Amino acid sequence: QVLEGLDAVRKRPGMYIGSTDGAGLHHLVWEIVDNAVDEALSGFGDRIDVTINKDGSLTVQDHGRGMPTGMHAMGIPTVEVIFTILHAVGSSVVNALSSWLEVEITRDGAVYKQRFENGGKPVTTLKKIGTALKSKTGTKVTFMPDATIFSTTDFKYNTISERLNESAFLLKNVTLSLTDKRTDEAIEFHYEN
Numbered sequence: 001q002v003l004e005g006l007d008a009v010r011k012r013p014g015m016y017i018g019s020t021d022g023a024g025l026h027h028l029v030w031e032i033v034d035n036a037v038d039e040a041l042s043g044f045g046d047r048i049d050v051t052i053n054k055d056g057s058l059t060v061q062d063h064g065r066g067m068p069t070g071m072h073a074m075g076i077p078t079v080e081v082i083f084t085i086l087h088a089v090g091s092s093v094v095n096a097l098s099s100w101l102e103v104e105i106t107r108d109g110a111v112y113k114q115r116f117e118n119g120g121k122p123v124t125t126l127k128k129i130g131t132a133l134k135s136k137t138g139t140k141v142t143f144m145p146d147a148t149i150f151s152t153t154d155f156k157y158n159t160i161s162e163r164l165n166e167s168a169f170l171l172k173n174v175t176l177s178l179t180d181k182r183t184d185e186a187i188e189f190h191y192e193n
């Protein structure tokens, strides 16, 4: 297994996301959403909220266990490792192809955040920013796709709606939501089984 840095993704984005048009753009969404869905499939979290922000960024929020908040080697957070080493893999690929990315993790009474910029260079460490009830857990990821890479950076509400509907149907007993802050449009999907 040859590990790579995020430069590799940025130099050959098609190898990771298929293309740099709208299909590629929306693959970034699918990677992040899929990580939230896997966590719910494992039984952690009953809602996954997706927001298309006014600034063009996109947020996915789950209520799963929260990415681990500890360290890997050399004082590097586990989360930073997940987001910055390519095991070529979703999180690091989206980070690489984003002009900025923020991950917020809530667990154990604490809220932590790390911010990356300019294709996934950390501009902070994983820092405690606040507190929450001990019962509160989850992961939140927000990213701004890199307009220097994609031919289009406009997320399409209908495209995302359809994919989240399908994901809700396959998962069962989990609410998937989409809110578009550009247009105020909103929808929820939930299939009981």
Ligand SMILES: C=CCNC(=O)Nc1nc2cc(-c3cccnc3)c(OCCN3CCOCC3)nc2s1
Residues within 6 Å of the ligand: 032, 033, 035, 036, 037, 039, 060, 061, 062, 064, 065, 066, 067, 068, 139, 140, 141
């Ligand atoms: C919100 C947008 C995308 N949503 C997400 O990405 N949600 C995620 N939720 C988790 C939860 C865990 C997790 C797992 C176990 C215990 N506590 C938390 C996790 O661990 C990383 C894999 N590790 C686990 C430790 O052993 C090596 C493998 N990753 C994610 S990623």
